[PDB]
Design a protein around this ligand. Structure first.
Ligand SMILES: O=C(O)c1cc(C(=O)O)c(-c2[nH]c(C(=O)O)cc2C(=O)O)c(C(=O)O)n1
Ligand SMILES: O=C(O)c1cc(C(=O)O)c(-c2[nH]c(C(=O)O)cc2C(=O)O)c(C(=O)O)n1
Ligand SMILES: [Ca+2]
Ligand SMILES: [Ca+2]
Ligand SMILES: [Ca+2]
Ligand SMILES: [Ca+2]
Ligand SMILES: [Ca+2]
Ligand SMILES: [Ca+2]
Lengths: 452, 452
């Protein structure tokens, strides 16, 4: 899709909803869920705390703090994945993923691992107990961790693990592994270094489903590959799997996740259109002092190999349902008319989640079969309509609730007339006039919007 | 997708198939079907003849000639739709559409109608009889008639009817009706002038299905709208509906047809990307002496209103699964790298059909879940892979059977190892070296390709 203008974002004020801050003292709140107890549960990414909030009264309890979570102030690591077993009454399990030190690591630049871990909920003492590591030794870094953890209708865990930031900034010269897959020998040694830029599908005990897809002749935990930073994952009522993902200077994506698909990163951003992006592989540059001009690969310094999207030899490439956004090769990623911080005008929205709106007896008119996608950089919640079979999007991403806030997650109440959102503690966001600010209106908050 | 180069088309020679020309100099052969008698049936658009061809010996019989078919030498009108009843053993019916004179027409420029008609096959006399008009008074013109007619798994007739060529060439100043839908009053009067640029869904007796979608508050024969020239339509084994469609200078489409969808034409060609196309509405131009610059709306003469794809206020817009092809705004539609005949280099392939390959006892290796799309302008047949649920394409359109022929239709034998193809009697096609020729290698032919 084509970017909205600052004016178009600023008008999305959602005057038909009442706003109320429920909690305002949260530290890097990350994931939000409607629990099986009809309470709101949420995570703090850096502290490792799991909180439960009474939606009616607003009282809150810290149910548990995951010990030894590792988090860097300049990083996106920490406590990430968070989901309830779907039959919680009879299987009182909570599944998380988190950053932990890796005692086997021989890399002082990458000292950590990601672990998918199960806890047992004790309703008598209201806490979590009996930790069990389902899948350990997964990649960890400060960048593009993703880490959405959901349980599908097949009662399998689906887990997004980002590309770790390879081929940008601090990891510029590391070779991106989004396209790479394990050998059988690597699986035998539990070497999961290729588990970057993937959606994983695991059994509830961490093992490999016997009907997972094959990649390059090997069936592993990988379900799909070729992802950059997929922070949104959500099943629809008819069992389809929708996803949101952050692109580089362009081409954030809404994807339909299908078994065995290849979503193209890093060779393809968004559509395979050769428009506004090309794959500049700095790991293949002979000179490691080469600079990244950060023009999305369209303009590069001498010495870095560049592959056009159409020059890639790919297999099972699946294009996105929608891009937020796609621009021409003539696009100027340095436009000075935007200000000193030109990145704010980049054709992206930085989606942070993806949530299937299920309606209810007070469902909001017109919102049937919508997907809600929070935007960090634009301070809106997008509403994206699909057809009733969730096979295609209809029309465009409609912005909602414009504010100077970094929206991190969103859910809705069972009746469907109240939305609950989390906001980041700090960072940059676009203002009504299109400029950048790091003064957030509601830092680290749980906010509700009630239809009136 | 990005256009293939002339060299990439030239190498797609399909050396793994044996070619045998069964017939040539057919009079504008148009549609072919594997018949209930395991013979090949095909139509001649210009004559109204329905021919049956013996696969083994190639003997041909003129089974029937549809009387009073109207065809213009320079036109795309004539005998069009052609399908067998799916339970032919117990329902020996053949369904057609055709151009016929309209006696109540009050326009000398548009004197004809399209009629969807049923015939009964009499096996004892080996001919057709007892015609029944199912739906008459449909639009008719020389351009963009489409006319693909299939019976769905719901035992409904699905019928594509093109936009009649409005807003180009001989119909430049007529207002395109692809976005328009009937009022209840027009329906009551059987005024079907808005049945342009649509997929129609009809009961077998021609009546309006009560479960057809609603458009602007009215349920009509319209199933989807916003199409230009959709010549390809085919159901998948799991009941989805795939489609191909010719765009203008760009953005031929492969579409997934979903009930009630709006496929954007003429406001949107291909994706809603503002890339290489804009909607110039010549019917709204200040005067009818203005010239069409034929630069796909990116540059137009003064006095014609232009609407960007992103400026359209649309409802239920459904984007294509694949475009053949999409180009940048700076693309040169009048490129001098080719000869005076710039159109042959336009980033299009002119898809003429769409056929779901179903395999069989001799299925071709690797062709699972593919869609075959013949190209008129490039002299190839494309193979397009989808995932096993027919929810997305995988990778790109792979060209096959490169020749100096305009491929018009394609089917496969039940065993799956033989393809049968129709070619046009006349027209332009691109040579190996990228230049145009109107010398066709196999004019008006039925061609058999057998996997080695
Ligand atoms: O403008 C853009 O394209 C853009 C903007 C941001 C932004 O939020 O400022 C991000 C981003 N996302 C996170 C996160 O925690 O998800 C952290 C950051 C960061 O830059 O620090 C990204 C990206 O990561 O691709 N792209
Ligand atoms: O280069 C292009 O884009 C292109 C090329 C052709 C071509 O075949 O020469 C056509 C076309 N298709 C038919 C048909 O019978 O299907 C007739 C014609 C015609 O121009 O006479 C179209 C189009 O109709 O959009 N576009
Ligand atoms: Ca980004
Ligand atoms: Ca992608
Ligand atoms: Ca792209
Ligand atoms: Ca065309
Ligand atoms: Ca379209
Ligand atoms: Ca377009």
């Amino acid at each position: 899709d084509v970017p909205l203008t600052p004016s178009q974002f600023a008008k999305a004020k959602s005057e038909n909803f009442d706003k109320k801050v429920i909690l305002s003292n949260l530290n890097k709140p990350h994931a939000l869920l409607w629990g099986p107890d009809n309470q709101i549960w949420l995570t703090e990414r850096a502290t490792g705390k799991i909180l439960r909030v009474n939606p009616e009264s607003g009282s809150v309890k810290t149910v548990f703090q995951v010990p030894e979570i590792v988090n860097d102030a300049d990083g996106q690591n920490g406590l990430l994945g968070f989901a309830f077993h779907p039959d919680f009454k009879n299987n009182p399990y909570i599944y998380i993923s988190g950053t932990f030190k890796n005692p086997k690591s021989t890399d002082k630049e990458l000292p950590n691992q990601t672990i998918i871990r199960r806890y047992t909920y004790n309703k008598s003492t209201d806490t979590l107990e009996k930790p069990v590591d389902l899948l350990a030794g997964l990649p960890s870094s400060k960048d593009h961790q993703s880490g959405r953890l959901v349980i599908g209708p097949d009662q399998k865990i689906y887990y997004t693990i980002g590309d770790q930031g390879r081929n940008q900034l601090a990891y510029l010269f590391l070779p991106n592994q989004a396209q790479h897959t394990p050998t059988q020998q690597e699986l035998n040694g539990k070497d999961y270094h290729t588990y970057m830029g993937k959606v994983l599908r695991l059994n509830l005990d961490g093992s490999i489903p016997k009907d997972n897809p094959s990649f390059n002749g090997v069936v592993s935990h990988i379900y799909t590959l070729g992802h950059r930073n997929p922070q949104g994952l959500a099943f629809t009522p008819n069992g389809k799997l929708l996803q949101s993902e952050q692109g580089p200077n362009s081409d954030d994506e809404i994807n339909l996740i299908v078994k065995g698909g290849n979503y193209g990163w890093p060779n393809v951003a968004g559509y395979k259109d050769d428009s506004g992006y090309a794959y500049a592989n700095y790991s293949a540059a002979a000179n490691k002092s080469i600079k990244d001009l950060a023009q999305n690969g369209v303009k590069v310094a001498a010495g870095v190999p560049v592959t056009k999207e159409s020059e890639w030899t790919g297999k099972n490439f699946v294009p996105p349902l929608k891009t937020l956004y796609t621009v021409q090769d003539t696009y100027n990623y340095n436009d000075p008319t935007c200000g000193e911080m030109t990145f704010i005008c980049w054709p992206t929205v930085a989606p942070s989640s993806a949530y299937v709106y299920k309606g209810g007896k007070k469902a909001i008119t017109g919102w049937e079969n919508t997907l809600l996608v929070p935007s960090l950089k634009r301070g809106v919640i997008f509403r994206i309509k699909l057809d009733p079979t969730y096979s295609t999007t209809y029309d465009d991403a409609v912005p909602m609730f414009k504010s100077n806030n970094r929206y991190r997650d969103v859910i809705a109440s069972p009746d469907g007339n109240v939305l609950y959102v989390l906001t980041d503690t700090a960072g940059n966001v676009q203002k009504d006039d299109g400029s950048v600010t790091n003064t957030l209106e509601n830092p680290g908050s749980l906010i509700k919007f009630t239809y009136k």
